[PDB]
Amino acid sequence: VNKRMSMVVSGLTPEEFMLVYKFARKHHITLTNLITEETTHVVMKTDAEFVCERTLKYFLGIAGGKWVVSYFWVTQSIKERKMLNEHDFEVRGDVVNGRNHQGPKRARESQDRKIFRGLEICCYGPFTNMPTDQLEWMVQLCGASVVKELSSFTLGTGVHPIVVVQPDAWNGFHAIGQMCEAPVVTREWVLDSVALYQCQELDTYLIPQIP
């Protein structure tokens, strides 16, 4: 059947983007500015060891089990006059969570065992640089159910509810625990788990609550 491809890039200069564009024109590949459920490939700017910075496209590419590949894939494919294999250029890590964690590969191979399967997540209060609905999409892609209001968690013993907050975007986030029994964690719990494609322990991300 058909090859299926639709590409975005992340962290590229306009000159580097124009090489992607030339590569996409040569091989007849769709290239868009925004990531969507159609996207198959995220082309990250990396160093020579395939380490990138963490952008929203990085997180969403990993979350969707997409090909998250170095820009070197493009440059080397131009030089070789053919589309090279993605496995040879896959992003290995990032400047926050580790240079060789292999989160992208882990996610691509783990879509039948998603990191937040069995969790219900409320993305609560203000976020910066990342609209609430994009954080909600990210966690859904990773197998969580999303709730919009605390009240609508529910229900018995095995849950498990989790409230995610970005304190520095905000007082109020210290009094959530007096209302519901769910652990309250920083947004870094989500981002770190997604980049590593490994559900992190809550402990270091818990936001101390007023008794």
Add this chain to the structure above:
Amino acid sequence: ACSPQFG
């Protein structure tokens, strides 16, 4: 414009 980074 410029994509935000998450340090």
